[PDB]
Amino acid sequence: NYLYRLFRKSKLKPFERDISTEIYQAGNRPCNGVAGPNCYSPLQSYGFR
Amino acid sequence: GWIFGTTLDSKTQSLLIVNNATNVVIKVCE
Ligand SMILES: *[C@@H]1O[C@H](CO)[C@@H](O)[C@H](O)[C@H]1NC(C)=O
Numbered sequence: 001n002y003l004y005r006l007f008r009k010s011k012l013k014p015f016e017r018d019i020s021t022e023i024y025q026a027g028n029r030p031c032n033g034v035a036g037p038n039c040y041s042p043l044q045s046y047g048f049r
Numbered sequence: 050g051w052i053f054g055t056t057l058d059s060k061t062q063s064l065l066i067v068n069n070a071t072n073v074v075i076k077v078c079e
Contacts (some may be wrong), residue, residue, distance in 0.1 A: 018061070020060055
């Protein structure tokens with residue numbers, strides 16, 4: 001139930017919130033909302049046990 | 050009034066300030 005963002009194209013300004021959910025472009029081919037090579041979701045879920 | 054934002058396509062928070070000569074309405078959501 002807890003998620004953290006690990007991929008972004010820049011660094012945040014102090015006291016800023018960004019809650020957008022778009023597929024990160026880590027390569028050259030566009031993601032177009034579909035996961036694949038060089039295309040990952042920006043938010044990874046925590047694994048608390 | 051004035052609108053503010055990055056892309057303004059219901060993908061990010063967009064600051065909106067509206068004057069109607071009675072109050073000032075400020076909202077953040079897209
Ligand atoms: C705000 O949006 C612009 C538009 O893409 C971007 O270049 C900039 O890095 C963003 N600011 C932050 C702090 O991420």
